[PDB]
Amino acid sequence: HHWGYGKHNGPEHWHKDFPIAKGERQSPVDIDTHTAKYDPSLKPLSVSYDQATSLRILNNGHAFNVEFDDSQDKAVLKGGPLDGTYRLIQFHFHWGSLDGQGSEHTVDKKKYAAELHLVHWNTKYGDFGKAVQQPDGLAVLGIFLKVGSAKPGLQKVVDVLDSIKTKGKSADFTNFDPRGLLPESLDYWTYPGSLTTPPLLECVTWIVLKEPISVSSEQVLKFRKLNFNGEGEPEELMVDNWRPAQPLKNRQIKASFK
Numbered sequence: 001h002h003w004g005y006g007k008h009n010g011p012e013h014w015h016k017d018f019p020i021a022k023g024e025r026q027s028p029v030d031i032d033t034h035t036a037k038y039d040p041s042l043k044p045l046s047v048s049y050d051q052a053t054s055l056r057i058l059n060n061g062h063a064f065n066v067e068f069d070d071s072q073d074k075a076v077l078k079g080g081p082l083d084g085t086y087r088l089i090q091f092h093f094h095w096g097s098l099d100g101q102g103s104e105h106t107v108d109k110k111k112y113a114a115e116l117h118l119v120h121w122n123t124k125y126g127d128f129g130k131a132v133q134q135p136d137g138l139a140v141l142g143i144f145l146k147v148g149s150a151k152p153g154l155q156k157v158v159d160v161l162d163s164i165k166t167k168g169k170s171a172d173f174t175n176f177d178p179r180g181l182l183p184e185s186l187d188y189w190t191y192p193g194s195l196t197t198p199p200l201l202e203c204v205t206w207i208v209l210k211e212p213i214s215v216s217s218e219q220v221l222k223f224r225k226l227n228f229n230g231e232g233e234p235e236e237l238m239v240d241n242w243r244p245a246q247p248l249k250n251r252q253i254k255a256s257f258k
């Protein structure tokens with residue numbers, strides 16, 4: 001498959017190879033804050049990242065992934081809408097060419113400058129590959145980024161990007177603390193959806209935090225210097241690697257708050 005974000009291979013084309021792109025539970029969506037309802041059945045959300053063990057950072061030609069050792073019981077997400085325990089495997093971002101766009105989810109149609117996705121798989125299914133054959137296989141914690149003050153906890157990611165400029169490059173990336181990317185509040189919206197890139201599998205419980213984190217203009221500018229292309233190929237800046245909002249269909253978005 002040769003999908004991407006361009007005019008000739010972008011989101012409007014994905015359905016030809018991945019017909020699930022026009023499915024009943026696709027992501028992202030617009031979160032209409034007035035239609036989302038507080039759900040008192042939601043349990044407290046638990047983000048337990050104290051033993052998170054990052055290993056590596058990879059430019060995969062679509063974004064960059066910070067990968068974790070998920071071989072033991074170590075950085076997990078539980079509670080909220082979730083039954084059981086979901087283990088962190090990687091995080092990545094989606095971002096824009098301009099500060100006015102870049103997020104995948106929108107909030108009352110507002111687009112943020114970027115969106116962080118912390119990807120977790122349901123341990124009852126044993127591995128990520130089996131989890132993505134299940135309707136409750138994955139949980140993704142989504143966090144909006146706005147441009148303002150720098151995020152100190154992001155700077156180690158920013159600083160390593162020079163070593164993974166092009167598709168297929170990786171670098172050791174140990175001892176990174178993903179707690180440094182979390183906002184003060186865990187208030188969230190939740191709904192059932194999908195991966196936002198091919199293969200677009202409908203296996204995700206989305207947990208989208210209401211409070212954005214702030215990053216500096218210089219931090220996001222460094223993201224925009226990455227390349228979609230491989231080394232020695234014509235330069236295509238890695239920008240606008242976001243899928244737009246998809247039809248909500250027969251879903252309800254629930255709020256954890258108020």
Ligand SMILES: [C]C1=[C][C]=C([B]([O])([O])[O])[C]=[C]1
Nearest residue numbers: 117119140194195196197
């Ligand atoms: C394999 C994979 C994992 C997560 C995502 B995303 O964008 O939905 O977080 C897309 C694809």
Ligand SMILES: [Zn+2]
Nearest residue numbers: 092094117196
């Ligand atoms: Zn993502």
